[PDB]
Symmetry: C2
Subunit: 170 residues, 2 copies
Protein backbone atom coordinates (compact mmCIF):
# COMPACT_ATOMS: atom_id res chain seq x y z
CA UNK A 1 0.00 0.00 0.00
CA UNK A 2 3.26 2.07 0.27
CA UNK A 3 3.51 3.82 -3.18
CA UNK A 4 0.61 5.25 -5.30
CA UNK A 5 2.43 5.72 -8.69
CA UNK A 6 5.07 3.61 -10.57
CA UNK A 7 7.54 4.45 -13.38
CA UNK A 8 8.49 1.99 -16.16
CA UNK A 9 11.63 1.05 -14.13
CA UNK A 10 9.41 0.24 -11.08
CA UNK A 11 7.31 -2.06 -13.36
CA UNK A 12 10.47 -3.70 -14.86
CA UNK A 13 11.66 -4.31 -11.23
CA UNK A 14 8.13 -5.78 -10.58
CA UNK A 15 8.62 -8.09 -13.66
CA UNK A 16 11.91 -9.39 -12.09
CA UNK A 17 10.08 -10.23 -8.80
CA UNK A 18 11.96 -7.47 -6.92
CA UNK A 19 8.95 -5.18 -6.10
CA UNK A 20 6.74 -7.68 -4.15
CA UNK A 21 9.46 -10.38 -3.67
CA UNK A 22 9.83 -13.83 -5.31
CA UNK A 23 6.70 -16.08 -5.31
CA UNK A 24 4.44 -12.95 -5.15
CA UNK A 25 2.55 -11.18 -8.01
CA UNK A 26 4.81 -10.26 -10.98
CA UNK A 27 4.06 -8.21 -14.08
CA UNK A 28 5.26 -9.93 -17.28
CA UNK A 29 8.53 -8.62 -18.80
CA UNK A 30 8.65 -7.37 -22.43
CA UNK A 31 7.26 -8.32 -24.84
CA UNK A 32 4.13 -9.46 -22.80
CA UNK A 33 4.26 -6.35 -20.48
CA UNK A 34 1.43 -4.00 -21.68
CA UNK A 35 2.01 -1.14 -19.17
CA UNK A 36 4.66 1.69 -19.20
CA UNK A 37 3.47 3.45 -15.98
CA UNK A 38 0.88 3.27 -13.16
CA UNK A 39 -0.30 6.92 -12.70
CA UNK A 40 -2.70 6.10 -9.76
CA UNK A 41 -3.35 3.10 -7.51
CA UNK A 42 -5.50 3.19 -4.30
CA UNK A 43 -7.46 0.63 -2.13
CA UNK A 44 -10.32 3.23 -1.63
CA UNK A 45 -12.49 5.17 -4.13
CA UNK A 46 -13.18 4.00 -7.68
CA UNK A 47 -16.65 3.16 -9.08
CA UNK A 48 -17.32 0.69 -6.18
CA UNK A 49 -15.29 2.31 -3.37
CA UNK A 50 -12.98 -0.79 -3.27
CA UNK A 51 -9.98 0.76 -5.14
CA UNK A 52 -8.82 1.98 -8.58
CA UNK A 53 -5.82 1.73 -10.99
CA UNK A 54 -4.99 4.19 -13.82
CA UNK A 55 -2.08 3.03 -16.06
CA UNK A 56 -0.64 4.10 -19.46
CA UNK A 57 1.11 2.47 -22.46
CA UNK A 58 2.88 4.80 -24.95
CA UNK A 59 2.20 3.88 -28.62
CA UNK A 60 4.71 4.26 -31.50
CA UNK A 61 4.71 2.51 -34.92
CA UNK A 62 7.66 0.20 -33.92
CA UNK A 63 5.90 -1.75 -31.07
CA UNK A 64 6.45 -5.43 -31.98
CA UNK A 65 2.74 -6.44 -32.39
CA UNK A 66 2.05 -3.87 -35.23
CA UNK A 67 4.30 -5.75 -37.77
CA UNK A 68 2.80 -9.27 -37.22
CA UNK A 69 -0.85 -8.13 -36.47
CA UNK A 70 -1.52 -7.83 -39.32
CA UNK A 71 0.92 -7.51 -42.32
CA UNK A 72 -0.51 -4.52 -44.30
CA UNK A 73 -3.14 -3.85 -41.56
CA UNK A 74 -1.38 -2.92 -38.27
CA UNK A 75 -3.63 -2.90 -35.14
CA UNK A 76 -2.91 -3.60 -31.43
CA UNK A 77 -4.39 -7.02 -30.61
CA UNK A 78 -7.53 -6.61 -28.42
CA UNK A 79 -6.29 -9.63 -26.38
CA UNK A 80 -3.18 -7.60 -25.25
CA UNK A 81 -5.36 -4.62 -24.16
CA UNK A 82 -7.48 -7.15 -22.25
CA UNK A 83 -4.27 -8.69 -20.80
CA UNK A 84 -3.09 -5.25 -19.52
CA UNK A 85 -6.33 -5.20 -17.42
CA UNK A 86 -5.52 -8.71 -15.99
CA UNK A 87 -1.86 -7.57 -15.41
CA UNK A 88 -3.16 -4.53 -13.41
CA UNK A 89 -5.61 -6.61 -11.27
CA UNK A 90 -2.69 -9.01 -10.51
CA UNK A 91 -0.45 -6.01 -9.60
CA UNK A 92 -3.28 -4.76 -7.27
CA UNK A 93 -3.40 -8.10 -5.35
CA UNK A 94 0.44 -8.03 -4.91
CA UNK A 95 0.34 -4.33 -3.92
CA UNK A 96 -2.16 -5.15 -1.10
CA UNK A 97 0.58 -7.52 0.25
CA UNK A 98 -1.12 -10.88 -0.57
CA UNK A 99 1.31 -13.77 -1.25
CA UNK A 100 1.38 -15.98 -4.39
CA UNK A 101 1.72 -15.95 -8.21
CA UNK A 102 -0.97 -14.27 -10.39
CA UNK A 103 -3.20 -16.16 -12.86
CA UNK A 104 -6.03 -14.58 -14.90
CA UNK A 105 -9.23 -16.62 -14.10
CA UNK A 106 -11.39 -14.98 -16.81
CA UNK A 107 -14.04 -12.26 -17.27
CA UNK A 108 -17.74 -11.67 -17.84
CA UNK A 109 -18.50 -9.51 -20.91
CA UNK A 110 -15.59 -8.16 -23.01
CA UNK A 111 -16.35 -5.63 -25.78
CA UNK A 112 -13.94 -4.20 -28.40
CA UNK A 113 -15.66 -1.21 -30.14
CA UNK A 114 -12.52 0.66 -31.40
CA UNK A 115 -8.82 0.02 -32.24
CA UNK A 116 -5.24 1.20 -31.53
CA UNK A 117 -3.53 2.21 -34.84
CA UNK A 118 0.27 2.84 -35.04
CA UNK A 119 -0.55 6.64 -35.31
CA UNK A 120 -1.94 6.71 -31.67
CA UNK A 121 0.06 8.40 -28.81
CA UNK A 122 -1.22 6.78 -25.58
CA UNK A 123 -3.42 3.93 -24.31
CA UNK A 124 -4.99 4.48 -20.83
CA UNK A 125 -6.32 1.66 -18.58
CA UNK A 126 -8.97 2.45 -15.91
CA UNK A 127 -9.52 -0.49 -13.45
CA UNK A 128 -12.33 -0.39 -10.82
CA UNK A 129 -11.88 -3.11 -8.13
CA UNK A 130 -15.37 -4.57 -7.37
CA UNK A 131 -14.51 -7.20 -4.70
CA UNK A 132 -11.56 -9.14 -3.18
CA UNK A 133 -12.21 -12.67 -1.76
CA UNK A 134 -9.84 -14.17 0.95
CA UNK A 135 -11.02 -17.82 0.99
CA UNK A 136 -8.91 -20.93 0.21
CA UNK A 137 -7.64 -18.85 -2.79
CA UNK A 138 -7.26 -15.01 -2.84
CA UNK A 139 -8.85 -13.32 -5.88
CA UNK A 140 -10.01 -9.94 -7.17
CA UNK A 141 -12.95 -9.01 -9.42
CA UNK A 142 -12.82 -5.70 -11.37
CA UNK A 143 -14.32 -3.76 -14.29
CA UNK A 144 -11.90 -2.10 -16.74
CA UNK A 145 -11.88 0.20 -19.78
CA UNK A 146 -9.18 0.77 -22.41
CA UNK A 147 -8.96 4.26 -24.01
CA UNK A 148 -6.70 5.55 -26.81
CA UNK A 149 -5.94 9.34 -26.83
CA UNK A 150 -9.12 10.14 -24.77
CA UNK A 151 -11.51 7.72 -26.57
CA UNK A 152 -12.99 4.58 -24.86
CA UNK A 153 -12.49 1.52 -27.16
CA UNK A 154 -12.64 -1.64 -24.88
CA UNK A 155 -14.62 -2.67 -21.75
CA UNK A 156 -14.45 -5.78 -19.55
CA UNK A 157 -16.88 -6.62 -16.69
CA UNK A 158 -15.94 -9.16 -14.00
CA UNK A 159 -12.18 -9.46 -14.74
CA UNK A 160 -10.99 -12.15 -12.24
CA UNK A 161 -7.35 -12.71 -11.14
CA UNK A 162 -6.28 -15.29 -8.52
CA UNK A 163 -3.11 -15.76 -6.42
CA UNK A 164 -1.49 -19.26 -6.18
CA UNK A 165 1.04 -19.91 -3.34
CA UNK A 166 4.03 -22.36 -3.55
CA UNK A 167 1.70 -25.31 -2.55
CA UNK A 168 -1.11 -24.40 -5.08
CA UNK A 169 -1.17 -26.46 -8.32
CA UNK A 170 -3.35 -25.19 -11.23
CA UNK B 1 -15.09 -23.77 -48.40
CA UNK B 2 -12.48 -25.54 -50.65
CA UNK B 3 -10.03 -27.15 -48.11
CA UNK B 4 -10.91 -28.78 -44.71
CA UNK B 5 -7.39 -28.97 -43.13
CA UNK B 6 -4.36 -26.56 -43.16
CA UNK B 7 -0.62 -27.07 -42.45
CA UNK B 8 1.57 -24.46 -40.73
CA UNK B 9 2.75 -23.29 -44.21
CA UNK B 10 -0.93 -22.79 -45.27
CA UNK B 11 -1.42 -20.62 -42.12
CA UNK B 12 1.83 -18.65 -42.78
CA UNK B 13 0.52 -18.04 -46.37
CA UNK B 14 -2.80 -16.93 -44.71
CA UNK B 15 -0.77 -14.48 -42.48
CA UNK B 16 0.77 -12.94 -45.68
CA UNK B 17 -2.75 -12.37 -47.17
CA UNK B 18 -2.15 -15.01 -49.88
CA UNK B 19 -4.81 -17.59 -48.79
CA UNK B 20 -7.97 -15.37 -48.93
CA UNK B 21 -6.35 -12.45 -50.87
CA UNK B 22 -5.39 -8.92 -49.68
CA UNK B 23 -8.08 -6.98 -47.71
CA UNK B 24 -9.67 -10.31 -46.57
CA UNK B 25 -9.28 -12.16 -43.22
CA UNK B 26 -5.61 -12.77 -42.24
CA UNK B 27 -4.14 -14.78 -39.38
CA UNK B 28 -1.42 -12.85 -37.51
CA UNK B 29 2.22 -13.80 -38.32
CA UNK B 30 4.62 -14.92 -35.54
CA UNK B 31 4.89 -14.03 -32.75
CA UNK B 32 1.08 -13.25 -32.45
CA UNK B 33 0.06 -16.41 -34.47
CA UNK B 34 -1.23 -18.98 -31.88
CA UNK B 35 -2.02 -21.85 -34.32
CA UNK B 36 0.36 -24.42 -35.98
CA UNK B 37 -2.36 -26.38 -37.89
CA UNK B 38 -6.14 -26.53 -38.56
CA UNK B 39 -7.00 -30.28 -38.33
CA UNK B 40 -10.76 -29.79 -39.19
CA UNK B 41 -12.92 -26.93 -40.50
CA UNK B 42 -16.54 -27.32 -41.75
CA UNK B 43 -19.65 -25.03 -42.22
CA UNK B 44 -21.97 -27.90 -40.97
CA UNK B 45 -22.00 -29.95 -37.73
CA UNK B 46 -20.51 -28.74 -34.45
CA UNK B 47 -22.49 -28.18 -31.21
CA UNK B 48 -25.00 -25.88 -33.04
CA UNK B 49 -24.94 -27.39 -36.55
CA UNK B 50 -23.46 -24.09 -37.93
CA UNK B 51 -19.81 -25.29 -38.30
CA UNK B 52 -16.70 -26.29 -36.31
CA UNK B 53 -12.90 -25.69 -36.19
CA UNK B 54 -10.30 -27.98 -34.52
CA UNK B 55 -6.75 -26.48 -34.46
CA UNK B 56 -3.46 -27.30 -32.65
CA UNK B 57 -0.41 -25.42 -31.27
CA UNK B 58 2.72 -27.49 -30.43
CA UNK B 59 4.31 -26.52 -27.07
CA UNK B 60 8.07 -26.58 -26.31
CA UNK B 61 9.97 -24.74 -23.52
CA UNK B 62 11.49 -22.19 -26.03
CA UNK B 63 8.19 -20.51 -27.17
CA UNK B 64 8.83 -16.76 -26.67
CA UNK B 65 6.05 -16.08 -24.07
CA UNK B 66 7.46 -18.62 -21.47
CA UNK B 67 10.60 -16.46 -20.75
CA UNK B 68 8.75 -13.11 -20.17
CA UNK B 69 5.52 -14.61 -18.60
CA UNK B 70 6.74 -14.88 -15.93
CA UNK B 71 10.51 -14.88 -15.03
CA UNK B 72 10.86 -17.93 -12.69
CA UNK B 73 7.18 -18.92 -13.30
CA UNK B 74 6.67 -19.79 -17.00
CA UNK B 75 3.00 -20.12 -18.15
CA UNK B 76 1.26 -19.48 -21.51
CA UNK B 77 -0.72 -16.23 -21.17
CA UNK B 78 -4.49 -17.00 -21.01
CA UNK B 79 -5.03 -13.94 -23.30
CA UNK B 80 -3.06 -15.71 -26.14
CA UNK B 81 -5.17 -18.91 -25.79
CA UNK B 82 -8.23 -16.66 -25.95
CA UNK B 83 -6.71 -14.87 -28.99
CA UNK B 84 -6.23 -18.22 -30.83
CA UNK B 85 -10.06 -18.64 -30.55
CA UNK B 86 -10.61 -15.12 -32.06
CA UNK B 87 -7.96 -15.93 -34.78
CA UNK B 88 -9.92 -19.14 -35.67
CA UNK B 89 -13.34 -17.36 -35.83
CA UNK B 90 -11.71 -14.72 -38.12
CA UNK B 91 -10.21 -17.53 -40.30
CA UNK B 92 -13.74 -19.11 -40.48
CA UNK B 93 -15.30 -15.86 -41.83
CA UNK B 94 -12.53 -15.59 -44.51
CA UNK B 95 -12.86 -19.31 -45.35
CA UNK B 96 -16.62 -18.81 -46.06
CA UNK B 97 -15.48 -16.25 -48.71
CA UNK B 98 -16.65 -13.03 -46.93
CA UNK B 99 -14.59 -9.91 -47.77
CA UNK B 100 -12.84 -7.60 -45.24
CA UNK B 101 -10.25 -7.48 -42.40
CA UNK B 102 -10.91 -9.33 -39.10
CA UNK B 103 -11.36 -7.58 -35.72
CA UNK B 104 -12.22 -9.36 -32.44
CA UNK B 105 -15.42 -7.65 -31.07
CA UNK B 106 -15.35 -9.40 -27.67
CA UNK B 107 -16.91 -12.34 -25.78
CA UNK B 108 -19.44 -13.26 -23.11
CA UNK B 109 -17.98 -15.37 -20.28
CA UNK B 110 -14.28 -16.38 -20.40
CA UNK B 111 -12.97 -18.88 -17.82
CA UNK B 112 -9.35 -20.00 -17.23
CA UNK B 113 -9.38 -23.08 -14.91
CA UNK B 114 -5.96 -24.61 -15.86
CA UNK B 115 -2.58 -23.60 -17.41
CA UNK B 116 -0.07 -24.46 -20.17
CA UNK B 117 3.38 -25.20 -18.60
CA UNK B 118 6.56 -25.47 -20.76
CA UNK B 119 6.43 -29.32 -20.17
CA UNK B 120 3.14 -29.64 -22.22
CA UNK B 121 3.16 -31.22 -25.77
CA UNK B 122 0.03 -29.83 -27.51
CA UNK B 123 -2.74 -27.23 -27.11
CA UNK B 124 -6.03 -28.04 -28.94
CA UNK B 125 -8.71 -25.43 -29.84
CA UNK B 126 -12.34 -26.55 -30.40
CA UNK B 127 -14.55 -23.75 -31.93
CA UNK B 128 -18.35 -24.19 -32.33
CA UNK B 129 -19.87 -21.53 -34.65
CA UNK B 130 -23.22 -20.43 -33.10
CA UNK B 131 -24.40 -17.81 -35.67
CA UNK B 132 -23.17 -15.66 -38.59
CA UNK B 133 -24.87 -12.25 -39.23
CA UNK B 134 -24.77 -10.62 -42.76
CA UNK B 135 -26.07 -7.10 -41.97
CA UNK B 136 -24.22 -3.78 -42.53
CA UNK B 137 -21.21 -5.64 -40.98
CA UNK B 138 -20.52 -9.42 -41.28
CA UNK B 139 -19.78 -11.16 -37.96
CA UNK B 140 -19.61 -14.58 -36.33
CA UNK B 141 -20.49 -15.72 -32.79
CA UNK B 142 -18.90 -18.94 -31.42
CA UNK B 143 -18.13 -20.92 -28.25
CA UNK B 144 -14.59 -22.26 -27.82
CA UNK B 145 -12.52 -24.45 -25.48
CA UNK B 146 -8.74 -24.69 -25.04
CA UNK B 147 -7.28 -28.09 -24.01
CA UNK B 148 -3.67 -29.08 -23.19
CA UNK B 149 -2.71 -32.78 -23.74
CA UNK B 150 -6.40 -33.94 -23.49
CA UNK B 151 -7.42 -31.69 -20.54
CA UNK B 152 -9.92 -28.76 -20.91
CA UNK B 153 -8.42 -25.59 -19.28
CA UNK B 154 -10.21 -22.53 -20.90
CA UNK B 155 -13.76 -21.79 -22.17
CA UNK B 156 -15.25 -18.76 -23.92
CA UNK B 157 -18.98 -18.23 -24.71
CA UNK B 158 -20.10 -15.70 -27.34
CA UNK B 159 -16.71 -15.03 -29.01
CA UNK B 160 -17.52 -12.32 -31.63
CA UNK B 161 -15.36 -11.46 -34.69
CA UNK B 162 -16.34 -8.88 -37.35
CA UNK B 163 -15.14 -8.17 -40.92
CA UNK B 164 -14.33 -4.55 -41.97
CA UNK B 165 -14.10 -3.76 -45.74
CA UNK B 166 -11.84 -1.04 -47.31
CA UNK B 167 -14.56 1.65 -46.60
CA UNK B 168 -15.18 0.56 -42.92
CA UNK B 169 -13.46 2.71 -40.23
CA UNK B 170 -13.30 1.33 -36.65
Amino acid sequence: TKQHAFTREDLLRCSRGELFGPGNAQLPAPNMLMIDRIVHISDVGGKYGKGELVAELDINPDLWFFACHFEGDPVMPGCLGLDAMWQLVGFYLGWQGNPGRGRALGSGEVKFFGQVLPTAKKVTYNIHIKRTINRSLVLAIADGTVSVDGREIYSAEGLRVGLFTSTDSF
